[PDB]
From Swiss-Prot:
Gene name tied to this protein: recA
Organism annotation: Mycobacterium tuberculosis (strain CDC 1551 / Oshkosh)
Name listed for the protein in its UniProt record: Protein RecA
Family label: Belongs to the RecA family.
Binding positions for ATP per the UniProt entry: 63-70
Matches recorded under InterPro entries: AAA+_ATPase, DNA_recomb/repair_RecA, DNA_recomb/repair_RecA_CS, Hint_dom_C, Hint_dom_N, Hint_dom_sf, Homing_endonucl, INTEIN
Length: 310
């Protein structure tokens, strides 16, 4: 009665004092921004609330080796470019596969890449790149690889990388908000020297393999699962699942089906997926195949899922 106002008044003070998203009810609707960076899965886009990754923000994506985290980041890179943006890849790992990147949709030719000498240089170069104003996205691969110059010069010992990140991030956060650039930090499972990244990041994503998809004895890629453990732009703790196919990446068509049935926009009478009276396919694969062959209906289904949600 008289509490609902005192609560709303307190929530408003918190919002004004520390910014939007400082407090949220988990049932709240996502507040929709002008532009986001789609992730490649509509499922993940919905779990993120705002339909993609936020701009001008620190994003962390973490998981075990060979989990899908990079693939997810490369899809962000592909989508940012497809919207006419520029991308940079700060590489301290040296594992990137550009052919794979190509098949996801990355314009590798125009992808700025840097292979820095030290952890500080990696972040400095990231910073100069961001302050330009010309960059839509920058991926850092990865936190664990940002080894301190001192350590690489064989020279203080404990906490130097953690201090290197904290400092870098303090400066970088402003540059990002001002520039509108998204910075994805990839991280192996304070897991890496990213005790600080945990607090600077506006989105944190936990990526994992759930089960290997099969096509006989030799299968195909994996069913991936992402939890949005931190989300300052929409209520957190949302999970999403989607498929990553070896050589292809995230099955956009697969996420449309799943979320299609989830929303009742697609009906599954037996093994037959149907859409607005028409049949899509028998079994998931045929329905998936039907959607790549007919991009018109795929976009049709995508348009309908977005409307129903945001
Ligand atoms: Na790769």
């Amino acid at each position: 009665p008289d509490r609902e106002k005192a609560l709303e008044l307190a929530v408003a003070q918190i919002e004004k004092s520390y910014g939007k998203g400082s407090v949220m009810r988990l049932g709240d609707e996502a507040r929709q921004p002008i532009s986001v960076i789609p992730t490649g899965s509509i499922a993940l886009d919905v779990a993120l609330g705002i339909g993609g990754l936020p701009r001008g923000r620190v994003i962390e994506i973490y998981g075990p080796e060979s989990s899908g985290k990079t693939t997810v980041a490369l899809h962000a890179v592909a989508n940012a470019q497809a919207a006419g943006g520029v991308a940079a890849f700060i590489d301290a790992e040296h594992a990137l596969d550009p052919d794979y990147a190509k098949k996801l949709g990355v314009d590798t030719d125009s992808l700025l890449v840097s292979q820095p000498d030290t952890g500080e240089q990696a972040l400095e170069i990231a910073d100069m790149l961001i302050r330009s104003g010309a960059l839509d996205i920058v991926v850092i691969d990865s936190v664990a690889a940002l080894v301190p110059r001192a350590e690489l010069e064989g020279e203080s010992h404990v906490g130097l990388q953690a201090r290197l990140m904290s400092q870098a991030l303090r400066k970088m956060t402003g540059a990002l908000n001002n520039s509108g650039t998204t910075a994805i930090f990839i991280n192996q499972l304070t897991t890496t020297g990213g005790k600080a990244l945990k607090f600077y990041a506006s989105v944190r994503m936990d990526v994992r393999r759930v089960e290997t998809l099969k096509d006989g004895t030799n299968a195909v890629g994996n069913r991936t699962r992402v939890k949005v453990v931190k989300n300052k732009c929409s209520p957190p703790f949302k999970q999403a699942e989607f498929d990553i196919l070896y050589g292809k990446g995230i099955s956009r068509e697969g996420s449309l089906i799943d979320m299609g049935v989830d929303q009742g926009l697609i009906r599954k009478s037996g093994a037959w997926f149907t859409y607005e009276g028409e049949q899509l396919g028998q079994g998931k694969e045929n329905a998936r195949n039907f959607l790549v062959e007919n991009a018109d209906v795929a976009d049709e289904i995508e348009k309908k899922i977005k409307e129903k949600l945001g």
